[PDB]
Amino acid sequence: MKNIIRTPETHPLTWRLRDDKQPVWLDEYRSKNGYEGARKALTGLSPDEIVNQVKDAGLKGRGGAGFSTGLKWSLMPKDESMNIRYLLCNADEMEPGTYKDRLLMEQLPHLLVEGMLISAFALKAYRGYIFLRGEYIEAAVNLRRAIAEATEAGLLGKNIMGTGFDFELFVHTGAGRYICGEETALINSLEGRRANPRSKPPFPATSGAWGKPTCVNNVETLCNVPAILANGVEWYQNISKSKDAGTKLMGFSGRVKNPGLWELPFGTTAREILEDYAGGMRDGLKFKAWQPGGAGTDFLTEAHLDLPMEFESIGKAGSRLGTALAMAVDHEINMVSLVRNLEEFFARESCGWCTPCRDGLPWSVKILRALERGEGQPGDIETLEQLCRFLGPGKTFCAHAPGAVEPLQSAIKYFREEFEAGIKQPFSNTHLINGIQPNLLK
Amino acid sequence: AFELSAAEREAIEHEMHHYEDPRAASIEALKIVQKQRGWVPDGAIHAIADVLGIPASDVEGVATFYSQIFRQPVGRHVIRYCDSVVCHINGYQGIQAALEKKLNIKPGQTTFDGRFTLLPTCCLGNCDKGPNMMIDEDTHAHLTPEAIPELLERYK
Amino acid sequence: ATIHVDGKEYEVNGADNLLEACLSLGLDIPYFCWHPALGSVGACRQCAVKQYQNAEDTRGRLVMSCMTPASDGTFISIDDEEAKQFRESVVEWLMTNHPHDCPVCEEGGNCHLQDMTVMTGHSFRRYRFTKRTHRNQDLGPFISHEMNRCIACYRCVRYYKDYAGGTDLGVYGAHDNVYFGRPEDGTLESEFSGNLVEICPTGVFTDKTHSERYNRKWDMQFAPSIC
Amino acid sequence: CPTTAIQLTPDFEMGEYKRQDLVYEKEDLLISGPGKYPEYNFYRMAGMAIDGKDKGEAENEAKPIDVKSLLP
Ligand SMILES: NC(=O)C1=CN([C@@H]2O[C@H](COP(=O)(O)OP(=O)(O)OC[C@H]3O[C@@H](n4cnc5c(N)ncnc54)[C@H](O)[C@@H]3O)[C@@H](O)[C@H]2O)C=CC1
Ligand SMILES: Cc1cc2nc3c(=O)[nH]c(=O)nc-3n(C[C@H](O)[C@H](O)[C@H](O)COP(=O)(O)O)c2cc1C
Ligand code: SF4
Ligand code: SF4
Numbered sequence: 001m002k003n004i005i006r007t008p009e010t011h012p013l014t015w016r017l018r019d020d021k022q023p024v025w026l027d028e029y030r031s032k033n034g035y036e037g038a039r040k041a042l043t044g045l046s047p048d049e050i051v052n053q054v055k056d057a058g059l060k061g062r063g064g065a066g067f068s069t070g071l072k073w074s075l076m077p078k079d080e081s082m083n084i085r086y087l088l089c090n091a092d093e094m095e096p097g098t099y100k101d102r103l104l105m106e107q108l109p110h111l112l113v114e115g116m117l118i119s120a121f122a123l124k125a126y127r128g129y130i131f132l133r134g135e136y137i138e139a140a141v142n143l144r145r146a147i148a149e150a151t152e153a154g155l156l157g158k159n160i161m162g163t164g165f166d167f168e169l170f171v172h173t174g175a176g177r178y179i180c181g182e183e184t185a186l187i188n189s190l191e192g193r194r195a196n197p198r199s200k201p202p203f204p205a206t207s208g209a210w211g212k213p214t215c216v217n218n219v220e221t222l223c224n225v226p227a228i229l230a231n232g233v234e235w236y237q238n239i240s241k242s243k244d245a246g247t248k249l250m251g252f253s254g255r256v257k258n259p260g261l262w263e264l265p266f267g268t269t270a271r272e273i274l275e276d277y278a279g280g281m282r283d284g285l286k287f288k289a290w291q292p293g294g295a296g297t298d299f300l301t302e303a304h305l306d307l308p309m310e311f312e313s314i315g316k317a318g319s320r321l322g323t324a325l326a327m328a329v330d331h332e333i334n335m336v337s338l339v340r341n342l343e344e345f346f347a348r349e350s351c352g353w354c355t356p357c358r359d360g361l362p363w364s365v366k367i368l369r370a371l372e373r374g375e376g377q378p379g380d381i382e383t384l385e386q387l388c389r390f391l392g393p394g395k396t397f398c399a400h401a402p403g404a405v406e407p408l409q410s411a412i413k414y415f416r417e418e419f420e421a422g423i424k425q426p427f428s429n430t431h432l433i434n435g436i437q438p439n440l441l442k
Numbered sequence: 443a444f445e446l447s448a449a450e451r452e453a454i455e456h457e458m459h460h461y462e463d464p465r466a467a468s469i470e471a472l473k474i475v476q477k478q479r480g481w482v483p484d485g486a487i488h489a490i491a492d493v494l495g496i497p498a499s500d501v502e503g504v505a506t507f508y509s510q511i512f513r514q515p516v517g518r519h520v521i522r523y524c525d526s527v528v529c530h531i532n533g534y535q536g537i538q539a540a541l542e543k544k545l546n547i548k549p550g551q552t553t554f555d556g557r558f559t560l561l562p563t564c565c566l567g568n569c570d571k572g573p574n575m576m577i578d579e580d581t582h583a584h585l586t587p588e589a590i591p592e593l594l595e596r597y598k
Numbered sequence: 599a600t601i602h603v604d605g606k607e608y609e610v611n612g613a614d615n616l617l618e619a620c621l622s623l624g625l626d627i628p629y630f631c632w633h634p635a636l637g638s639v640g641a642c643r644q645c646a647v648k649q650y651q652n653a654e655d656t657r658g659r660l661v662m663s664c665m666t667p668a669s670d671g672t673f674i675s676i677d678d679e680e681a682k683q684f685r686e687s688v689v690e691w692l693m694t695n696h697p698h699d700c701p702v703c704e705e706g707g708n709c710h711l712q713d714m715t716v717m718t719g720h721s722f723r724r725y726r727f728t729k730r731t732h733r734n735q736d737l738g739p740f741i742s743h744e745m746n747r748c749i750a751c752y753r754c755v756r757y758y759k760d761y762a763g764g765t766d767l768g769v770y771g772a773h774d775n776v777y778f779g780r781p782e783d784g785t786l787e788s789e790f791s792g793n794l795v796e797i798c799p800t801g802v803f804t805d806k807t808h809s810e811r812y813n814r815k816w817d818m819q820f821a822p823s824i825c
Numbered sequence: 826c827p828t829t830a831i832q833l834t835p836d837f838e839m840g841e842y843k844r845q846d847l848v849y850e851k852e853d854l855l856i857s858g859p860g861k862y863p864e865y866n867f868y869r870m871a872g873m874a875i876d877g878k879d880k881g882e883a884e885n886e887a888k889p890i891d892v893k894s895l896l897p
């Protein structure tokens with residue numbers, strides 16, 4: 001579908017993009033209704049009024065989990081003695097299959113700057129950090145230039161717009177770990193420590209970065225904020241007739257005709273995304289599987305392609321919506337090799353804190369290597385299944401290992417024939433010792 | 443054996459100004475030393491620790507936790523080819539085989555000339571244009587195995 | 599506070615966590631990363647029990663007893679089959695990379711890892727692949743270092759750094775190649791480094807002075823004395 | 826015995842004149858061969874390094890990956 005008319009009413013995030021894929025700087029951004037929501041927020045709205053406005057707009061988190069943003073902002077302490085607060089932008093985006101934040105920050109940096117400004121004013125957060133991955137050189141350059149332009153234009157720094165709100169925005173480039181995207185591990189990596197996640201409670205809203213109240217939000221959530229405050233609650237609730245309010249960046253990748261990213265309302269079915277926007281599979285390819293929201297989501301089949309891309313609709317199907325960036329797997333891809341690659345990523349991106357991930361993902365990796373080489377033995381599939389069952393939520397310290405075992409569980413559930421075809425050798429981990437008769441178990 | 447230059451120390455202190463705690467500039471200090479010297483040598487750990495006022499074991503734990511902070515010497519150009527699932531579907535194995543045939547090295551090793559270091563990196567966040575490669579600061583997408591012996595020849 | 603463990607009623611301190619409250623009652627829950635003097639961090643995932651919402655609940659949920667408060671009216675099960683299977687699985691995951699070292703290990707007969715391996719009932723190996731190995735460091739004349747035996751329970755760094763205030767011991771690395779030691783070879787600088795031989799549940803940090811003239815714990819003649 | 830070092834052998838002629846001579850030291854016990862278990866070597870299985878066997882050279886052992894290595 002080339003005929004995409006990106007009006008600001010239906011495409012609040014991508015209507016001011018440019019055809020040559022060039023970044024929109026401060027003059028062009030303010031020409032196309034820039035910092036209107038920030039002006040309204042900082043000249044005619046209380047911070048609690050903004051928090052309640054975002055809560056009434058129903059803005060959920062765009063970083064995969066779908067937690068409500070207004071409820072997260074309302075969990076900040078009501079003490080007036082805690083005024084050293086921090087806002088963090090999770091620009092890490094280390095999940096395989098996820099490329100939305102790169103587009104948003106390379107081409108519209110001032111949208112992120114305005115969203116950080118509005119969210120910091122709502123949270124009464126004196127300081128803001130953009131935790132960005134180190135592989136995004138152009139996004140870092142564009143964000144630093146946008147921050148410099150907003151600072152010289154009076155939109156950042158001391159006494160913004162004459163209200164008296166002081167806000168300083170920094171860009172922190174990471175050093176390449178997938179676990180750094182997890183918000184408590186993100187806080188640990190921001191503090192100059194090893195990025196081990198933290199147990200919750202306490203949540204970062206009460207004790208976050210350097211012990212202060214801290215709110216971590218994804219890039220796309222903070223890009224959703226300025227349109228909410230520039231158009232209103234009823235406009236954000238009246239663009240989609242679904243329980244998930246607002247629009248979402250969705251797109252199919254991998255052996256499709258037009259891989260890319262498009263802004264679509266919630267409740268859009270995955271089949272029409274794949275057929276109209278992605279163009280379907282390429283020539284001589286048969287669609288066999290797909291992942292809805294990145295490497296940490298369960299595989300779904302052709303029958304699940306008709307489901308709307310919502311949190312609850314895909315949650316009921318045995319998966320989760322995730323980042324809503326789907327990946328298509330054709331019939332030429334062996335599922336054992338694909339899950340082997342996924343589990344190698346998840347095993348080597350472990351942080352090493354807790355036993356089941358650290359010592360059970362490598363066992364699953366070695367089993368999958370054996371099944372890919374055809375050297376599988378009986379009990380390997382049962383071992384994979386009990387690794388899936390014992391790496392679920394609550395068994396491990398953070399959510400990295402449940403997201404690791406979701407593709408393994410789904411692929412064993414659907415494409416079990418390949419995993420059973422990997423097994424060719426009899427089971428043996430004990431060799432013969434010359435003078436000792438073995439205990440011949442049955 | 444190691445001594446921080448004046449520009450390195452000034453950049454490290456400037457990064458220390460941006461945080462509540464001077465410990466929070468450890469990753470930036472390691473990246474500054476790596477940018478100036480190609481990698482982080484052994485004396486640099488104690489130098490960074492002495493500047494930041496944190497123990498050298500904390501600096502070493504940070505430097506060995508993060509894969510982009512190099513702790514062994516590397517080549518002049520670090521090839522970082524993507525390894526994740528979407529580039530697996532788009533065929534990164536042909537790219538890896540082409541790189542290993544052209545450079546005659548396994549991943550994680552350096553050529554005898556000291557020109558290239560081959561590394562399998564994580565997902566580069568460019569999955570719709572896969573397979574992806576990242577030489578020192580440049581991302582190259584839409585890779586084909588026949589374009590490698592031309593792509594590698596403009597990094598002298 | 600009142601807790602119900604396996605249908606039996608106990609009166610505990612509500613400011614305690616469930617692991618220390620149940621160990622004070624004489625109940626046996628396996629654990630590695632918890633120490634009474636160091637607090638709870640929930641790393642090793644060994645102390646799992648099954649917590650129920652109320653008395654008339656049967657499904658329950660596996661919780662870490664070291665990270666769970668012993669609040670009033672709590673319902674847990676230690677001998678639940680799911681909890682026992684998970685604890686045995688944690689021991690098995692630790693056993694996958696552990697070296698075949700007990701006869702030539704100074705910790706043998708005095709090893710918390712041996713005790714918890716036997717306590718969970720894990721005695722059958724089905725892992726068939728390779729074991730990760732590590733180089734050792736020279737930690738000085740008092741502490742001998744054997745990094746193969748590590749189960750990554752983080753007790754050494756928590757004691758030495760957070761408790762004792764030492765600066766030259768740390769954790770380095772990542773996913774399953776975590777290394778606990780000094781940044782380089784040299785003598786451990788803390789005046790309280792010798793407590794690592796009892797803090798470490800395995801034989802990584804061992805009494806080198808004892809190791810020169812080693813004998814097992816059952817062969818010792820002990821007495822209570824004053825330093 | 827976890828190394829198959831100590832073994833009971835088919836031999837019964839052990840009478841003595843003095844009871845003190847029934848205390849056998851190591852030079853009275855150490856034979857010049859493997860006995861009833863001809864091939865088992867405990868040290869080929871143990872992870873502890875000795876002469877002729879470095880770290881990673883035991884059975885079912887991978888080579889030690891240095892913490893400073895470049896591979897993730
Ligand atoms: N690149 C990406 O966008 C990636 C996204 N994910 C997604 O992230 C999720 C897992 O991450 P988590 O942070 O562990 O998820 P989570 O569900 O534990 O929490 C997500 C957010 O909700 C907040 N929250 C939840 N319950 C709360 C409570 N009771 N009180 C206060 N705040 C509360 C947390 O502070 C956090 O900001 C999954 O849904 C996964 O799909 C995972 C990997 C990569
Ligand atoms: C292993 C792991 C990796 C994650 N990586 C990211 C990430 O790269 N970017 C991101 O925005 N959230 C990531 N998250 C989710 C965060 O924990 C957190 O929910 C999010 O950053 C902010 O929530 P929000 O969607 O309400 O804004 C990750 C979570 C886990 C468990
Ligand atoms: S599951 Fe455990 S070891 Fe794995 S990344 Fe999370 S805390 Fe770290
Ligand atoms: S640390 Fe314990 S289990 Fe490991 S070799 Fe020594 S005695 Fe055996």
Ligand code: SF4
Nearest residue numbers: 748749751752754798
């Ligand atoms: S060295 Fe000992 S105390 Fe430290 S993490 Fe390893 S097993 Fe635990």
Ligand code: FES
Nearest residue numbers: 524529565566569
């Ligand atoms: S999977 Fe290779 S760029 Fe994302």
Ligand code: FES
Nearest residue numbers: 631642643645664
């Ligand atoms: S003792 Fe509770 S998880 Fe380690």
